[PDB]
Design a protein around this ligand. Structure first.
Ligand SMILES: O=C(NC(=O)c1ccc([N+](=O)[O-])cc1)N[C@@H]1O[C@H](CO)[C@@H](O)[C@H](O)[C@H]1O
Ligand SMILES: O=C(NC(=O)c1ccc([N+](=O)[O-])cc1)N[C@@H]1O[C@H](CO)[C@@H](O)[C@H](O)[C@H]1O
Ligand SMILES: O=C(NC(=O)c1ccc([N+](=O)[O-])cc1)N[C@@H]1O[C@H](CO)[C@@H](O)[C@H](O)[C@H]1O
Ligand SMILES: O=C(NC(=O)c1ccc([N+](=O)[O-])cc1)N[C@@H]1O[C@H](CO)[C@@H](O)[C@H](O)[C@H]1O
Ligand SMILES: *Cc1c(COP(=O)(O)O)cnc(C)c1O
Ligand SMILES: *Cc1c(COP(=O)(O)O)cnc(C)c1O
Lengths: 809, 809
C-alpha cells in the first residue's frame, strides 16, 4: 500500500502465507476453526522470526571470522516495547506481511496489538539503551546489549478513583517468541563468603552460588542484514519431607534476583536485592566477555578488543569485578590490571540530582561482596594519592573526591568510582555535560580534563518515525527519497519545501489523520470522545516534581478560570493530555496524578466549557502508547526547571513527528532550538543562570502568590476543596509544598509560561503558518538521530568505525 | 535394522533428514559447526513431534463430532519417563529415524539419553497411571489424564559415603518440547474464605484465588493414529517500593502449589500444601470437564457422558466438589446431585497399610475449604442414616463407618468418603481385593456388595517390551508375528516352542546380549566391572520395610558367610543388584540403603570371594533405568510379606522380559504363578493365613534367632560392627527393629527364602532348563498387559466399549 513499507511480491507473499499456515498447524497445534486471535499473532511472529535466523547466524559467524573490537553496553534497563512491527520494518517485510495476512482474512494491525511490551525499563535511560541497540546494528558495530531478564517489568498502571494502582507486568505469561535460551552458557555468580589472604594473593571463599542463564534476543539493523544480540541473564538456583519440601521451595529466594525491575526512578534506595541484581549482571557479563575474548594470554590487548559502556552507575561494579578477575584469577599485577580496566571502561551520567545518585552503605558491600569492598578501598587509596600529588595541601578536595563518604553510615559513591575507573565520562546533552564540569564533577574535571566528554542523546528514526508514523515518512520519501531513514540529516532538504503549497497540505493532512486515529483509539479502548479539531496539548513522561507536570496543571486551571470569567469569548479549543507512571513510593508524584484526574472531573463536566477544553490523563503510558500518541500531538510540553532534565528524549520524538515545542532552555531543548532556530520554538522561563541567582537570594513562593491575582485564585481553589468537594483538604500537601518547599520553583516560571502558551494559541489560529513552522522543525531534527549519537560514541570513545555496508543474503 | 521397529523407506528418511535440518536451523538457531549434543536431541524431538500434530488435531476433532462418553483419569502422579522413543515406537518411525540420524552422522541412542525423565510420580501408583494412558489411547477410548505439572518431580538420588542424598529434579530446565500451554483454558481456583447462608442456598465468599493454567502433552496410541491428551495444571498468581517489590515476590507463595511432588510414599502427612495441591487439581479439572460437557442443561445425562476415575484418595475432593458445583452453582436438589455424583465417580485403592491412608484433620479442611467440610458432614449424616436403617442398633458399626473419626483431633477418612460417593471401588489384584472385603472395608462390603470389584494391574507391552527389549520382541515376532504387541495373550503361542532348540538358543542369546549391554553401561556411567556370566539377582523398587529389601540383605550375608566358611567349594556366581529411592523422612529406609552399600564394601573387596559374589546398589532408580536393568535380569525379587503388596507391577515387567521370579504369595505374584504354573515359579514363605496365625499368638523374633545358627551369626556381625568398623553401633537401629519391633516378620520367612534361593542356583546350573522355564513365563504373561486391565475398567466400570479400529491418516 505504502512504498516505504517495502515490496509485496507474489513469491514472497505466497511463501509468507504458507509458512504462516505451517506454524499455525505444527507450532500452535491449531486449525482455522479453533484458532484464537493470540494464536494468529504467534503464527505471524514465528513466520517473521524465521527470516531473522539466517542473518543472525551469519552475523555472529562474521564477527568470529573478522574478530572486530566488541562493544558491550551494560544496562539494568532495556525499554524495548514490542518487537513484531520493528522487525518487519528492518527486514522490509511490512507490506508483504500485510498483504499475506490480508489474503488469509486477517487484520495485521489487530494482531500487533496482542504482543506484550517488553517493558524492562523505567523511562528515558532504559529507552536510550533500546534506541542505541537499533543504531549500533544499523551502523554495523559488533555490539552486544547485556542486562537482566526480569520476569516482571515496569508495573501496569491502573487508574482507580483517580488514583494510580500498580499491577504486576507478567509479560512472559504467554511466552516470548523472540528469545532463545542458551543453556550452554550458564555461568556461576558468587555472593557473601569471606576473603582469605594466602601466600599467593587473596581468595574469595565460602560463597553462595547463583547460576546465570542467558536468553538471547535478535537486534536487526535497518535493511543491512546485520542482526546483533541482546543477552539477558536469568537467575537459577544450583540443583544441590518438611525439610526436603522447604529446601525445594527456598530455591525461589535465589531466583528472586531476576524477578522484578525496581520502579524507583526518582530516589535511590540502598536495597540488598537491587545490589544483588547489579552484581549479578556484571559478574555473568564479564565472564562471558572474557570467554569470548579468549575464544577469539596477554590482557594488554584486552582494551583493543573490548569496550564496556556503563549506562549510569548501576553496573559500576564492573570496575572492581574486572580488577578482581585480573588480579585474583589471572594473576596480573595491580598497575597493569588497572591500566587495562580504565582503558576498557566508559561511564555515562544521566542526572545531577543528588537523591538519584547511588551511594551504597559500606556494611552492605562488606557482607555481600567483601572482596570488592577491599578492591574499592585500594582504588580509593591510590586515586587520592594522585589527587594529593596534584593539589598538595588541599585537604578539603581529598574529602570531596574520595570514593568513600564519611558520616552517619559510611557509603561508597559509585559515581566517583566510575570516574576514577573509566577513560571517558560523558553527559547526555551539551548543557548537562557543561554543568557536570562546573558543579558535581568539577574537582574530577580539574584533575583529568581529557576524560570528560559530551554525547547528546538521540532516538532511532525507525521506531520513532517509519514505524509509528508511516504516513509522514511516506510524504517525506515521495519528495526526497528513502535515504534519510538511515541518514536523518537529509531531512534538511525539506527546508526547500516550506513554501510548497502541496507539501504544506500533506503535512497537515497526515497530522489530522493521526489525531482522528488517536481520537478513535481513545473511545474504543477507553471511554470518552475528544474534539479532533482541538489543539492536542501533550505531556507524557514519568511523573516527577522536576519535570513539572504541576506547572502544566496551573495553566490548565488558569485556562478554565478564564473561560468561566468570560464564557462567551472565543478561545482556541484544546485537549490537554498528561500521562506517565509514578514510582510506587513517590507520594507527591501520586498526588499529582490525583490532581490531574480531579481537574478533569471538573473541567470535562462543566456545561459552560463545552468542548473548548478537555483534560485527559493517559493511563499506562509505555512505549506502545508513545508510538500512538506522539504522532498525534500538536504541542509538546518539555517544561522542566532549567538545569534538572539532563537531556530528555521524548522531546526529540515529538519534534520528529510534527509537533511544535513549548519548553525551557533545559537539556536537549537548547540544542533543538539551536538547530531549528529560536523563532521556531516556544521558549520561556528562567535559564540556568536565573535559577542560580534565585537560589542565591532565596526562593520565596509567597512573593509570586501576592503579586499574581490569577495564581492566588488557583491556590485558593486548591486549598478550599474546589477540586475535591467531598475531601476539602485532599490537596493540602501540594499547596504546602508549592508555598513553602518547592525545590523546582513552579511559581517562578508561571507568568512567562502562561504568556508563552497564549502565543502558541495565536499561531494555531493560522493553520498555514503553524504548519510552516512544523516543517522547519521536522527539517532540522536530523541531529537527534541516535545514529549520529552512536557514531560519536564509536569514534570518540570506543575507537571503532561505523559501517553502512550491508552483508550477504 | 530390526523389522519390529518399522520400515525405513527412502522418501520417509529423506523427509526426516530435511525436517531435522530445518529445526536445527530455524528452531535451534544453530548449524552443524556449533551444535551441541542437546541441540541435536531437540532437533530430533521436534521432527518426531511434527508427526503427532495432524493425528492429535484429528483425534480431538473426532471426539467432538462423535461425542463419546469421556473418561477422566485423575491422579496426583504420572510417572511418564522419557517420551522420544515411545513416540517413535507408537508411530512406527523408529527405524526411519535411526537411519535418518545415522545418515547425518549421529547416534540416535546417544541423543535419547539426553532427554530428562518426566518423573512426576513416586513408583507403582504413578507408573500405573502412565501405562493406563498408553493402553487407553491404544484401545481408542476418549480418555484424558488430569494432574499437576510439578516443576520438580521425584528427587534425583545421589549416594554419598553410602548414604542417600536428595537433589532437586529440575526437569524443565532446558525446556519440554512435548508440552503445549493452553492459556485460553486458564481457570480460577478458590481457597479459604467463608460460607454465607442466604435465602437461596449457601455461598462461598471472601476467597483467595489462584489460577490454573493447563499444559497438554500428547499420548499416542499404538499405530492406530489415535492421540489422546494428558492435561497438567500449573499454578499462577492473579495479576491483581519495598511494599511493591515484596508484593511481586510474594506471588511465589501462590505458585508454590505446583512446585514439587511430595515424595512420601510410606506415611501420609497432613501437610497444608499437599491438601492445596489435591484441591487445585480437582477444582480445575471438574470445571474443564463441565465446560466440555456443556460444549458438546440437564445433568441427568452427565453420568452417561462422563466417567471420573480416582487414582487412590488423593483426588477424593472431586466428590464434594462435584456436589458443591451441582448444588451451589447449578442449583440441583441434593438427592439428584448425589445420584449424579455416585454414578460418575469410581475409586481405586492401592494399599491396606494404615499409615498410608489419608485422614485429614478437620481444622485444616475447616480453614482451607469451609464449604467442602459442610458438604462432607452432610454426606456423612445421610450415609450413616442408611447404615442405621440396614443394621438397626449396631452402634459400633456406625462409629466404624463414619467418614468422621473422633479422638485427639477429628479427622475425615478419605477412603470412607470415596466408597460412599462412588458406584465402584476396586482393588488392584485378586488377593488384595479379597482382603479389602474381609478386613478394612468389610462393613462397607456388607452394606453395598455390588460396589466392590477387582481389576488386576497390568503394564503396557509397548514401553515394557518393544521399547526396552527390541531383541526379545523381534525373536518373538519372527515366530508368531507382530499382532501380540496389542494383543499380548497371543504370547501363549510360544508354548509350542518350549522344545524348539532354535528358539531356546535365541531366548538365551537375547538375555546374554542385554546383560553385556548393561554390564557395560555400569562401567561407563558408574565405576565397576561385573561378571556378565553371573546370575543377575535384581530387586528394584522404592525402599520400604514391607517390601523387605532387608530379607534380601540377610540372604546376601548368608551367601558371603558360606563362601568364607568353605572358600574352595563351587557356588553359582551372582551379581546382586538392589536399587530404589527412600522417602526423605523415612529413617529406617535410609538405614537400609546404608546397610546395602556397607555390605557391598565388604563383599566386593574380599579376595577370597573373587567375582563369585558382587553386591551393587543401583543409584537413582527411575523409569529410564528400569528400561535398562529389567531386560538384563535373570532373577526378579518380589518378596514382600504376604498381604502387604497390593499388587506390584515391577513383577510383571520382569516376567515379560525373561527373568524367573522368586517371591511370596502376595499381590499379583499369586496370579502370575497361577498363569505360568507354580512349578515354573519360585514360591516361598508364609501365606496370608500363616501371617494371621502368627499375629494371633504373637510374633517373637528371638525364637528364630535362637533356633537358626546362620541367622544368629548375621545378627552378631551387624551388632559387632563387622560391616561398619569405624562405627560399631551404626546399625543398632536395624538390629533392634528386627529383634523387637518388626511388623513385617523378616525372620519368619528367612529359612524358606534361603532354601528357595538354593533351588534357584540349582536350576541356573542347567542353562537349557532355566531357559525353558523362562519361555513358559514369557508365554503366559499375556494377562498382565494393561490393555486387558483397561478393557475390564471400560466394560465393568466406565460403561464403554474398547476399539481396535485405527483412524484416518
Ligand atoms: O510450546 C509449544 N509447543 C508446541 O508447539 C507443541 C506442538 C506439537 C505437539 N505435539 O504433541 O504434537 C506438542 C507441543 N510451542 C510454543 O508456542 C509458543 C506460542 O505460540 C511459541 O512462542 C514458542 O516458540 C513455541 O515453541
Ligand atoms: O531515566 C532516567 N533515569 C532513570 O530511569 C533512573 C533509574 C534508577 C534510579 N535510581 O535511583 O535507582 C534513578 C533514575 N534518566 C533519564 O535518562 C535519559 C536518557 O539519557 C535522559 O535524557 C533524562 O534527562 C534522564 O532523566
Ligand atoms: O525458545 C526458542 N526460541 C527460538 O527457537 C528462536 C528462533 C529464532 C530466533 N530469531 O531471532 O531468529 C529467536 C528465537 N525455541 C525453543 O527451543 C526449545 C529447545 O530446542 C524447544 O523445545 C522449543 O519448542 C522451541 O520453541
Ligand atoms: O505406589 C503406591 N503408592 C504411592 O506411591 C503412595 C503415594 C502417596 C502416599 N501418601 O501417603 O501420601 C502413599 C503411597 N502404591 C502402589 O501402587 C501400585 C499400582 O497399583 C501397586 O501395584 C503397589 O502394590 C502399591 O504399593
Ligand atoms: C521516550 C520515552 C520516555 C522519555 O521521555 P522524556 O520526556 O525524555 O522523559 C519515557 N517513557 C517512554 C515510554 C518513552 O517512549
Ligand atoms: C514399575 C516401577 C515401579 C513399581 O515397582 P514395584 O516393584 O511394583 O513396587 C516403581 N518404580 C519404577 C521406576 C517403575 O518402573
Amino acid at each position: 500500500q505504502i512504498s516505504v513499507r517495502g515490496l509485496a511480491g507474489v513469491e514472497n507473499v505466497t511463501e509468507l502465507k504458507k509458512n504462516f499456515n505451517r506454524h499455525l498447524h505444527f507450532t500452535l497445534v491449531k486449525d482455522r476453526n479453533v484458532a484464537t486471535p493470540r494464536d494468529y499473532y504467534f503464527a505471524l511472529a514465528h513466520t517473521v522470526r524465521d527470516h531473522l535466523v539466517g542473518r543472525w547466524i551469519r552475523t555472529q559467524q562474521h564477527y568470529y571470522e573478522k574478530d572486530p573490537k566488541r562493544i558491550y553496553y551494560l544496562s539494568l534497563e532495556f525499554y524495548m516495547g514490542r518487537t513484531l512491527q520493528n522487525t518487519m520494518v528492518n527486514l522490509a517485510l511490512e507490506n508483504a506481511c500485510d498483504e499475506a495476512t490480508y489474503q488469509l482474512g486477517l487484520d495485521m494491525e489487530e494482531l500487533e496489538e496482542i504482543e506484550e511490551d517488553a517493558g524492562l525499563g523505567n523511562g528515558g535511560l532504559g529507552r536510550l539503551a533500546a534506541c542505541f541497540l537499533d543504531s549500533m546494528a544499523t551502523l554495523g558495530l559488533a555490539a552486544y546489549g547485556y542486562g537482566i531478564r526480569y520476569e516482571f517489568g515496569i508495573f501496569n498502571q491502573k487508574i482507580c478513583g483517580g488514583w494510580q494502582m500498580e499491577e504486576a507486568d507478567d509479560w512472559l505469561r504467554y511466552g516470548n517468541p523472540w528469545e532463545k535460551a542458551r543453556p550452554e552458557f550458564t555461568l556461576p555468580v558468587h555472593f557473601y563468603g569471606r576473603v582469605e589472604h594466602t601466600s599467593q594473593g587473596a581468595k574469595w571463599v565460602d560463597t553462595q552460588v547463583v547460576l546465570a542463564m542467558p536468553y538471547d534476543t535478535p537486534v536487526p539493523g535497518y535493511r543491512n542484514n546485520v542482526v546483533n544480540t541482546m543477552r539477558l541473564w536469568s537467575a537459577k538456583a544450583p540443583n544441590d519431607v518438611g525439610g526436603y519440601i522447604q529446601a525445594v521451595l527456598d530455591r525461589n529466594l535465589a531466583e528472586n534476583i531476576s524477578r522484578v525491575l525496581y520502579p524507583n526512578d526518582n530516589f535511590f534506595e540502598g536495597k540488598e536485592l537491587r545490589l544483588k541484581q547489579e552484581y549479578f549482571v556484571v559478574a555473568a557479563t564479564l565472564q562471558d566477555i572474557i570467554r569470548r575474548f579468549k575464544s577469539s594470554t596477554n590482557f594488554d590487548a584486552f582494551p583493543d578488543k573490548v569496550a564496556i559502556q556503563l549506562n549510569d552507575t548501576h553496573p559500576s561494579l564492573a570496575i572492581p569485578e574486572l580488577m578482581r578477575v585480573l588480579v585474583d584469577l589471572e594473576r596480573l599485577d595491580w598497575d597493569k590490571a588497572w591500566e587495562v580496566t580504565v582503558k576498557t571502561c566508559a561511564y555515562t551520567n544521566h542526572t545531577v540530582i543528588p537523591e538519584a545518585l547511588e551511594r551504597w552503605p559500606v556494611h552492605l558491600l562488606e557482607t555481600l561482596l567483601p572482596r570488592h569492598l577491599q578492591i574499592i578501598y585500594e582504588i580509593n587509596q591510590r586515586f587520592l594519592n594522585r589527587v594529593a600529588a596534584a593539589f598538595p595541601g588541599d585537604v578539603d578536595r581529598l574529602r570531596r573526591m574520595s570514593l568513600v563518604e564519611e558520616g552517619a553510615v559510611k557509603r561508597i559513591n559509585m559515581a566517583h568510582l566510575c570516574i576514577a575507573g573509566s577513560h571517558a565520562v560523558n553527559g547526555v546533552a551539551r548543557i548537562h555535560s557543561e554543568i557536570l564540569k562546573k558543579t558535581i564533577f568539577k574537582d574530577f574535571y580539574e584533575l583529568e580534563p581529557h576524560k570528560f566528554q559530551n554525547k547528546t542523546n538521540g532516538i532511532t528514526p525507525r521506531r520513532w518515525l517509519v514505524l509509528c508514523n508511516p504516513g509522514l515518512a511516506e510524504i517525506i520519501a515521495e519528495r526526497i527519497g528513502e535515504e534519510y531513514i538511515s541518514d536523518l540529516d537529509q531531512l534538511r532538504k525539506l527546508l526547500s519545501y516550506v513554501d510548497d503549497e502541496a507539501f504544506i497540505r500533506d503535512v497537515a493532512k497526515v497530522k489530522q489523520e493521526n489525531k482522528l486515529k488517536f481520537a478513535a483509539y481513545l473511545e474504543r479502548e477507553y471511554k470518552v470522545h475528544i474534539n479532533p479539531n482541538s489543539l492536542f496539548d501533550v505531556q507524557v513522561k514519568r511523573i516527577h516534581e522536576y519535570k513539572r507536570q504541576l506547572l502544566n496543571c496551573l495553566h490548565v486551571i488558569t485556562l478554565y478560570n478564564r473561560i468561566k470569567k468570560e464564557p462567551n469569548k472565543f478561545v482556541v479549543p484544546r485537549t490537554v493530555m498528561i500521562g506517565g507512571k509514578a514510582a510506587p513510593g513517590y507520594h507527591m508524584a501520586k498526588m499529582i496524578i490525583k490532581l490531574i484526574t480531579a481537574i478533569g472531573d471538573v473541567v470535562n463536566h462543566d456545561p459552560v466549557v463545552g468542548d473548548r477544553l478537555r483534560v485527559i490523563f493517559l493511563e499506562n503510558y509505555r512505549v506502545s502508547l508513545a508510538e500512538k500518541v506522539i504522532p498525534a500531538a500538536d504541542l509538546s510540553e518539555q517544561i522542566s526547571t532549567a538545569g534538572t532534565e539532563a537531556s530528555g528524549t521524548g522531546n526529540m520524538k515529538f519534534m520528529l513527528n510534527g509537533a511544535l515545542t513549548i519548553g525551557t532552555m533545559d537539556g536537549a531543548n537548547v540544542e533543538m532550538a539551536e538547530e531549528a532556530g529560536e523563532e521556531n520554538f516556544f521558549i520561556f522561563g528562567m535559564r540556568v543562570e536565573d535559577v542560580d541567582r534565585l537560589d542565591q537570594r532565596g526562593y520565596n513562593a509567597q512573593e509570586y502568590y501576592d503579586r499574581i491575582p490569577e495564581l492566588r485564585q488557583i491556590i485558593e481553589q486548591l486549598s478550599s476543596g474546589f477540586f475535591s468537594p467531598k475531601q476539602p483538604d485532599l490537596f493540602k500537601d501540594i499547596v504546602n509544598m508549592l508555598m513553602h518547599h518547592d525545590r523546582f520553583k513552579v511559581f517562578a516560571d508561571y507568568e512567562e509560561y502562561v504568556k508563552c502558551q497564549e502565543r502558541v494559541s495565536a499561531l494555531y489560529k493560522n493553520p498555514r503558518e503553524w504548519t510552516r513552522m512544523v516543517i522547519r522543525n521536522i527539517a532540522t531534527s536530523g541531529k537527534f538521530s541516535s545514529d549520529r549519537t552512536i557514531a560519536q560514541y564509536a569514534r570518540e570513545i570506543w575507537g571503532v568505525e561505523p559501517s553502512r555496508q550491508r552483508l550477504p543474503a
